[PDB]
C-alpha cells in the first residue's frame, strides 16, 4: 500500500553503520547512533507529508510534497546541501538527495504491518524496518 500513515517502531537495522560511514557522519557520533531503536511518526495527506523521527538522543523532521523538489541542508547530520525530490515508483516511495554523494537518498515501503526504508549514500546501504504501534 502507499499509506504510510502511523507511528512506527523499529525493529530491525542492518548496516546503519556503513550508510552513516558513508555520509562521513563523526566516528564519535556513529557510536552513539549506530544500534539506537528508532521510531517513526508519519502523517501523510495526499502529497504531503510531515515525517518525524525519534529516539533517545536524536529527534528529526522534515515535510515535504511528492514530486516538489526542495533544496536541504543537512546540518544536523552531514552538514551538506542536497536537492531533494520524494516521488513514487509503483508503491515504493523514493527520495533523491542531488548532491557531492552518488546514490544518495532513501525507498521507503509498505508490506504488512511493516514499514521498510532502505538509505542510500554511495555503495552503502541500510535496511530498516519498522512495525507498525
Ligand atoms: C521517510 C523516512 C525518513 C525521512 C528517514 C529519516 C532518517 C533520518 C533522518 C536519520 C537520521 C540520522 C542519521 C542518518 C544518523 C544518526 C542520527 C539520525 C538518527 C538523526
Redesign the pocket.
Same mark, same amino acid.
Given at each position: 500500500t502507499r499509506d504510510q500513515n502511523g507511528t512506527w517502531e523499529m525493529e530491525s537495522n542492518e548496516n *546503519?553503520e556503513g550508510?552513516?560511514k558513508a555520509?562521513d +557522519?563523526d566516528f564519535a $557520533?556513529?557510536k552513539i547512533?549506530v544500534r539506537?531503536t528508532?521510531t517513526?511518526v +508519519?502523517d501523510q495527506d495526499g502529497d504531503n *507529508?510531515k515525517?518525524k $523521527?525519534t @529516539?533517545t538522543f *536524536?529527534?528529526?523532521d522534515?515535510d515535504f510534497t511528492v514530486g516538489v523538489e526542495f533544496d536541504e541542508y543537512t546540518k @544536523?547530520?552531514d552538514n551538506r546541501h542536497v536537492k531533494a525530490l520524494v516521488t513514487w515508483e509503483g508503491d515504493v516511495?523514493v527520495?533523491v538527495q542531488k548532491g557531492e554523494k552518488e546514490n544518495r537518498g532513501?525507498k521507503?515501503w509498505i508490506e504488512g504491518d511493516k514499514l521498510y526504508?532502505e538509505?542510500t549514500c554511495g555503495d552503502q546501504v541500510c535496511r530498516q524496518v519498522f512495525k507498525k504501534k
Amino acid at each position: 500500500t502507499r499509506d504510510q500513515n502511523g507511528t512506527w517502531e523499529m525493529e530491525s537495522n542492518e548496516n *546503519f553503520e556503513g550508510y552513516m560511514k558513508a555520509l562521513d +557522519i563523526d566516528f564519535a $557520533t556513529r557510536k552513539i547512533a549506530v544500534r539506537l531503536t528508532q521510531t517513526l511518526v +508519519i502523517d501523510q495527506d495526499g502529497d504531503n *507529508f510531515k515525517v518525524k $523521527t525519534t @529516539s533517545t538522543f *536524536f529527534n528529526y523532521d522534515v515535510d515535504f510534497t511528492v514530486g516538489v523538489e526542495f533544496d536541504e541542508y543537512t546540518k @544536523s547530520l552531514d552538514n551538506r546541501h542536497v536537492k531533494a525530490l520524494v516521488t513514487w515508483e509503483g508503491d515504493v516511495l523514493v527520495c533523491v538527495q542531488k548532491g557531492e554523494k552518488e546514490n544518495r537518498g532513501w525507498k521507503k515501503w509498505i508490506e504488512g504491518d511493516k514499514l521498510y526504508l532502505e538509505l542510500t549514500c554511495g555503495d552503502q546501504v541500510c535496511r530498516q524496518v519498522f512495525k507498525k504501534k
